């Protein structure tokens, strides 16, 4: 359904206002169209009416089409893409690059083919969009993004749960009609514990990331009683909810069910650590499942940030079992205390118990079993799972496949992912292995609540406009 | 059919170029959207996405719809327009309630919205997209469209605009012969007023350029032939025309001369062979060497030239004459339309110009049986022996003419629009000269050009969003 009165406060503006934007923004090619879908599309749309860059556009289109393609049609989509653009006078044979990257792709894998067009497409042809209409309309789409979207603009009625900080909800964006889990906090209780620093650190990195295994924050505002942060909804429940209490006499999960979730996690942590950031506490109950069936990772008090120029960070906190060996003694540890935690999680996924313990001891024996004891496996495991879990559960962090080379490119090779080609999961087209059932104050604080509230977080907002049709139905020409 | 290579030299530009345009142009409201259809439409299009000025837009739309409406549905379209806007559901809220009383003929109703629509709401278009695209449509208009851009094959020629595929009569002149007669002044005066007028009873000039051998001027298409072609040589044993056939053409002429003379300008030479017929069946007037201009502050102009018979009485002696030497010429034409001969003479009788002048001045018109009385009572007006008793240009328009009995059937609206089924559908050089040829060639004449883009779809298919 759709609302009108809140959709009415949203109009397409004039041009004497988009001049304060012109100077203060400095989006280099990369930060704009390639990442911002309203940019993407508007610039797509610039290459659509301008006839000279059809071949380069469709080129890139069909690269995104092959990127996500299935696994018995990749040979065919390859022979489709090779016959259209590459070789003896193709009919959409473009003429702006020379002929050095034509040689590059002939072996397979067409990833370097893509970056060859990107580099150029962002230089000589890119000049025009800027000095053309489509871009300007973006400024005006952009203009309305830089606006104050307060408590008025969202609704409350059904609540997720209660840990302590406040009350967690699902909320609909009124004008458009999009749903969002918006976490709400009793302000007085927040200042009551100096819990400022764990939350903002948690906020600062939410808006900076868009990985569909990480709760993507859309908005940030101040009501009066509470502070809020819209993130991409998750219903049914968490993974413990499923592991232990979905099917009782058949405890735990099957093989492709746990695999599918483990992979979605691998890429969430990749994004986590690509920006130099730790999760520390990683477990099933700290992982959710949406109505669509694509999981994420949740609850981010334990979300410490690593700075720039420094190497490591120290401490003592987390969850007994999902701490690493080098985390319990209290030494300098890399991100793989998460990957160690994941190993324990993956076990408790397909075990119905903590890996060292028995199902359902003090923290000293749990620490002594975290460090020393190896994993004694039963019959239920397939060999690919056993050969892989021995990597995560190593007693030191240099032999455990942690964050290496900048991405999990060494992890993604590992035997357990043969069926799963490492593309489709990052997009969102794979049928997940279980679909669910649906139906008085000082100055220092009020100056912070408005600092905290940066109104909008840009890109999920952009996505909301494009997916809901809001972009489509006010980007009108006739 | 359509061409590609010439349609390829026509692209939508960037924005760092439309800055020399910003300062040097000064289009006040009237000169832009209300008259320029690409402005009209783009601004229409601005009021289409902006939801607050739907009622004002459709208001004006339905005024243009009623303006042209037929004559047994005007009572109904009135009761349709009165029930929609005059608590109506598209009741607009920007004007007060003084013009609501006025209309209770809705012409003053229209100018009430126009006045306002061009003031408070008009500010935005300017500072909005739709206008900018106009700047870029405008930019490409200010371009050199030379000899390359047009074709010749059938002859004065007919020429097709290659890229789009639109037809045009483009009049071409041997330059050396032009300078050979100091015939500069009669042509430029003739050019200067062609581009300044768009009346569909006047050859509307679209372009102006220089080839090398010739200078040219594209004007709006007419096929079959001229009126003599029909009068004398359409149906041989039934010479001339019927009654509603000649009437229909005579009326179209009345309004062409109205436009001719509204701007203080004379045709002098008016005749059937100097009147054409298009494929659609709406006529115009043609060949404008004899197209002298009257200035400002002066009263009259003198001379000796034209065509023996279609000169006036006061034109042959060589005195000061008003426009009605045309209207006198028209009387002779209307006769030769429905007679198959010159009014005074006998058909094809080759008398000299002295007896033709003596019969132009003295002799009255001896009518036969074929005429209906409304035609006889009217032609006696045009063929009077002096210009003060002949119904010439009076009051600023032919409002005294339009009353006359011969036009009962014809209500004086539909012919000006273009919806009436016409009564016959068809089947070495110095510096002073090369500096003038490029002055002469102002490249484009804006509005018929604009029309070409909108009618051919050229506007429609490069004004694309998706």
UniProtKB/Swiss-Prot annotation, chain B:
GO biological process, one term: protein autophosphorylation
Entry GO terms, CC: cytoplasm; photoreceptor disc membrane
Protein's UniProt name: Rhodopsin kinase GRK1
Keywords noted in UniProt: ATP-binding, Cell projection, Kinase, Lipoprotein, Membrane, Methylation, Nucleotide-binding, Phosphoprotein, Prenylation, Sensory transduction, Serine/threonine-protein kinase, Transferase, Vision
EC number: 2.7.11.14
Limits of the RGS domain: 29-135
The keyword Membrane is annotated on this UniProt entry: yes
Keyword Kinase: yes
Membrane topology: Lipid-anchor
Gene name of this polypeptide: GRK1
Boundaries of every Protein kinase domain copy: 150-407
């Amino acid at each position: 359904s759709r609302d009108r009165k809140y959709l009415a406060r949203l109009k397409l503006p004039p041009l004497s206002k988009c001049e304060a934007l012109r100077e203060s923004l400095d989006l280099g090619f990369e930060g704009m169209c390639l990442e911002q879908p309203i940019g993407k599309r508007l610039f797509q749309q610039f290459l659509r009416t301008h006839e000279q860059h059809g071949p380069a556009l469709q080129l890139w289109k069909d690269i995104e089409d092959y990127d996500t393609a299935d696994d018995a049609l990749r040979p065919q989509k390859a022979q489709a893409l090779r016959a259209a653009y590459l070789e003896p006078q193709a009919q959409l044979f473009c003429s702006f690059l020379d002929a050095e990257t034509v040689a590059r792709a002939r072996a397979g894998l067409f990833q370097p083919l893509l970056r060859a067009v990107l580099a150029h497409l962002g230089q000589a042809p890119f000049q025009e969009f800027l000095d053309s209409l489509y871009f300007l309309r973006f400024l005006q789409w952009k203009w309305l993004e830089a606006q104050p979207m307060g408590e008025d603009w969202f609704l409350d009625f059904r609540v997720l749960g209660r840990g302590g900080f406040g009350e967690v909800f699902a909320c609909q964006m009124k004008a458009t009609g999009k749903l969002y889990a918006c976490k709400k906090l009793n302000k007085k209780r927040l200042k009551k514990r100096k819990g400022y620093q764990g939350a903002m650190v948690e906020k600062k990195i939410l808006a900076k990331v868009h990985s569909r295994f990480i709760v993507s924050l859309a908005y940030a505002f101040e009501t009066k009683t509470d502070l809020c942060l819209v993130m991409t909804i998750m219903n049914g429940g968490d993974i413990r909810y499923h592991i232990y209490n979905v099917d009782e006499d058949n405890p735990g999960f099957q093989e492709p069910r746990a695999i599918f979730y483990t992979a979605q996690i691998v890429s969430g942590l990749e994004h986590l650590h690509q920006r130099n950031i730790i999760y520390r506490d990683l477990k099933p109950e700290n992982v959710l499942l949406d109505d669509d069936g694509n999981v994420r990772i949740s609850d981010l008090g334990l979300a410490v940030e690593l700075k720039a120029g420094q190497t490591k960070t120290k401490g003592y906190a987390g969850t007994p079992g999902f701490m690493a060996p080098e985390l319990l003694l209290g030494e300098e540890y890399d991100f793989s205390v998460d990957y160690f935690a994941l190993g324990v999680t993956l076990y408790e996924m397909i075990a119905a118990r903590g890996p060292f313990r028995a199902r359902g001891v003090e923290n000293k024996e749990l620490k002594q079993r975290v460090l020393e004891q190896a994993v004694t496996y039963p019959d239920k495991f397939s060999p690919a799972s056993k050969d892989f879990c021995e990597a995560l559960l190593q007693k030191d962090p240099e032999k455990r496949l942690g964050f290496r080379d900048g991405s999990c490119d060494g992890l993604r090779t590992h035997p357990l992912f043969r069926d799963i080609s490492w593309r489709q999961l990052e997009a969102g087209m794979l049928t997940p292995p279980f679909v669910p059932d649906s139906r008085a104050f000082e100055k220092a604080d009020t100056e912070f609540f408005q600092e905290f509230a940066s109104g909008t977080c840009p890109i999920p907002w952009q996505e909301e406009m494009i997916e809901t049709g809001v972009f489509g139905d006010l980007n009108v020409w006739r």
